[PDB]
Symmetry: C6
Subunit: 219 residues, 6 copies
């Protein structure tokens, strides 16, 4: 990654063993549960495109997902190149060349180049641009690997309301509902999908109940 | 987080793998036992609003609680905006804009903005303001998830007084009794809820007994 | 805690995940065995009153002990206030106010205030003052939770003398005998409580035997 | 490795216990699964040729692979010497000598020499040159140890398409197909090797289907 | 401990959690096997007398040994005071007082005092003086807890010579034979205590055989 | 060890808990498998003779090996003293004395002396000189503890060629064959010791086959 040291200049630092192992172990343990994504983002704080490729290449299984991700990256790299075409032919001696999509993705750029862009005044933030492409891809994978529709999350007859709500919102998160819809669903599908006893209690509460209110009501 | 480095200037540092894992593992192991909250506070020392969102987003289960928390945050953000309305329309070139509720919560502000506020002279402490909203929410969750009323903590016939007192005060903590009431309860409900043999001993001690005195008396 | 950095000025540093986990795990594993206290002291090296409260608040069980500790702290805070009364009414603009008992205990003081006191020339050592109150309380808890009188530690008929001595001194430590008495007991209660065969050997050694001499004698 | 310190000069630092253990444990756990290679590269960030030899020499099993690797290194070292012959006879007093293949590989050069080359202006990047030879060798080993042809990865009758695709691309990675072929295979061998039910669905999708599209189609 | 920081001045640093846990776990796992002593020495590198007491006080079992150690420390402290008597009555304002035995042992000196002595030009090395007393005591404990005389280590009839030699020298180390005697024993007691078949082989080798020679001979 | 700090001067640093534990655990887990030696070398990067003795003294078992090592060290120390005799009688006030064999080995030199030699301009590299003696000794131990002649490593009838080659080269490494012989053995003993089916295949390949070629041939 690129860090500020103890004296305020941005320098390259090697990716640490602890970060490398943390990422590999979260993918091993959680696969593409939605909470893997914020973990990836955090673990890649300050990353170069080299570092991001390191992290992705250290994954051993999930190769269908990693091929899907490559496809998304290639789509974004192609959109970059549409928006920001670069001069063909020789670079000015000693001067910084403009990055292409594949340079942002780390496949045609050197570490030195990357460092140069990321530490330019002002920075050409190749690591953040690439990390956004990656995360776009990873979100597609999360959606793909979500096993259950929201329509199929219904409260069992002896299921504590809290356990049902946990299932409900875990599902909505993997299915990638907007925050609008998660906020909204409390007045709709959450009640509809509740068991008869709790449905009756929630219906009587009236509209505008907070989730806390609904949860206390059906405790 | 924002740290002072080895030379006394406040700079951004990436959240460490160790902090990220510590938080995820405490939620995994303790759920919303009350002692999770001081742990969250400590682990988020120096945090930006970005960091706080990272920590909260890395939680994989407990999604009913995380939706409740979002609701509390939105209520506090709305109260902020009531108290501190911001100018609509264009910001002064190069100048710091005033934060809105959603900027404090990290959803509409960049990391750079956050850094700017937190390192301003004097600081606009967006990470501490947000952390207070979070903790308000988390305390509600703790209360929600407390399984037992204080009224139902009664000393068994062969239960060592110390084990009863441990249950009693663990309950009072999750139920969120004030320190007044925890201090006071030693003269009241603690005795009332003691088994007959210990109740007799405690009654004879007289008023004003310290907890230590009561515990020695019923050992 | 407050640390000297790499250039010799005292600055605040966040409590580390490793320190937070070390404390929680020692209480989990050892409860209030006497050796928990020096561990607490060491783990709280440099602590602010905020840090000390963090450590104590991260404990999840043992709430009878934690309520006893609060009581001891309140007694010491009251004695502080008797000895060092503070001016009522407004503080001099920009100037350091004098700490009250509850400010030393971290309940009515900010982190900034604490830092200010601890880094004043000369320091008002609020973290060390509070740590002493805490340790006074913790020593009471250790004594409370000591399960066995010294009078009941007697060497079994087939018990190796060394194993008996280990029990004996472990007990004396939890019971909180002075070093005088631990030094002295070798000529008295240690022999008295030895089995017949070893008692005979020790009696013949004469007075003034070192523990090493007694242990070799009964090997 | 060679690091920039906190003040921007490149200095030697000892290889850390954590890096040494991370490498040994990845070889122990993963052998020569393809994802070991990016791990080796990352763990050897900044390495001297001494460090690279340390890492390779700390491996205890897999000695057929380590002998193959020595052979590849010797081939590359011989090609170096063909391309960059060095002056025979005495070096200029106090001056940097030119590296031979065996000096790049760390067998005839001192650590000091290595440091000298790597920190020269401009650097003679002996650690990166050697790391490339190593990785050339390791890729041969990965191919050698790949247990299954791509021709033999066929979707079972009750095998979820996603699990088949994972096997398929894991195989292609160990077999060392180019990215061309991995990108291309989605229109060919992937469909051909799919079970009858999914083959029918994929055939109907038409050409140009993304992997995501194919995976959704056969879910 | 007292460390040089990144700029070459000697400053106090808190004892780390990792050092505190390492010591407690080595005593837990190895008790007073001889190799605990060099571990203690290494873990206490740079220690103040405060730190050494911390380490010793964090030990929970082995209280007969810890009382023996206190006795040895008191004997050395008394010998110090015989050799280096201090002025009674008031210290020169602002000036460093001379340490007494109990000040070296950390029982009557403050951390500040200790720091002062250890960082004086030239240092009064109170931590090294005390560490020597401690190690004198610990060596007595090792000898005490050694379970077997060297006379009783004899090679079994089917015991590999190497396993016998390992037992032999492990015993000699716990029994605290000088290096003279360990060097010498190869010509004497080692052969005498060997089984008949190996004894015959060793006798024929002649005098002056190295241990390596003896071990190869009886392989 | 001696390190360069963050500002480029060579200073002493305490051996870390992590390094101390890493060494003890590798000896515990691997004994004197050949790969322990490069691990020892790496873990002792920058070591003083004090540090090297610490590492060796922290080993609890294997005392026959540790006595053999002492013997080798004493032989090298005696050869040093033959080559580099030192002045008898008093040292020049304030000046650096010349090291004797036992000073290099850390038994008659102080840490301060060692530091002085290692940081002299130019250095008298006592830690590297001693580390070479140690490694000479450890290599003898590895050879001693190698359980099997190369002559006895023969491919079983159903043993995969790769598994045989792994055994073969693991053996050659413990037996301490030169790289000449390991390079050469591929044309000789490796084939001779192969099972009949693979022997026939290898014989037909002709001379000059690489190991990779031989391994592919017999897959
Ligand atoms: N293993 C990887 N998986 C997903 C994306 C990228 C990875 O590494 C880099 C890459 C990107 C695009 C094409 C080829 C390689
Ligand atoms: N997972 C989260 N859970 C609770 C609160 C906040 C979290 O992340 C940020 C957030 C806050 C409010 C609305 C949407 C997202
Ligand atoms: N959990 C705590 N337990 C014991 C003492 C203090 C703790 O935190 C601070 C405190 C002290 C006194 C009253 C209230 C809170
Ligand atoms: N164990 C090693 N294995 C593979 C390659 C290199 C290793 O160490 C260095 C080496 C290279 C070439 C010949 C001899 C030694
Ligand atoms: N637990 C201790 N055990 C052995 C020696 C010292 C220890 O702490 C300090 C001490 C030394 C002497 C008397 C009293 C206390
Ligand atoms: N345990 C040790 N084992 C092997 C060699 C050295 C060790 O420590 C130092 C030493 C060397 C020579 C004689 C005595 C002690």
């Amino acid at each position: 990654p690129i860090v500020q040291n103890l004296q305020g200049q941005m320098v390259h630092q090697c990716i640490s063993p602890r970060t490398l192992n943390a990422w590999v172990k979260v993918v091993e343990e959680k696969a593409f549960s939605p909470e893997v994504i914020p973990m990836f983002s955090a673990l890649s704080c300050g990353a170069t495109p080299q570092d991001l490729n390191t992290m992705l290449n250290t994954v051993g299984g999930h190769q269908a997902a990693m091929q899907m991700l490559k496809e998304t990256i290639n789509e974004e790299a192609a959109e970059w190149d549409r928006l920001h075409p670069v001069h063909a032919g020789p670079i000015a001696p000693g001067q910084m060349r403009e990055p292409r999509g594949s340079d942002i993705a780390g496949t045609t750029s050197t570490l030195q180049e990357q460092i140069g862009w990321m530490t330019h005044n002002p920075p050409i933030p190749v690591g953040e641009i690439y990390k956004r492409w990656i995360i776009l891809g990873l979100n597609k994978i999360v959606r793909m690997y979500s096993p259950t529709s929201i329509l199929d999350i219904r409260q069992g007859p002896k299921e504590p309301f809290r356990d049902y709500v946990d299932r409900f919102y875990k599902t909505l998160r993997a299915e990638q509902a907007s925050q609008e819809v998660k906020n909204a669903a409390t007045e709709t599908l959450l009640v509809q999908n509740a068991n008869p006893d709790c449905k009756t209690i929630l219906k009587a509460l009236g509209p505008g109940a907070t989730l806390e209110e609904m949860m206390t009501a059906c405790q």
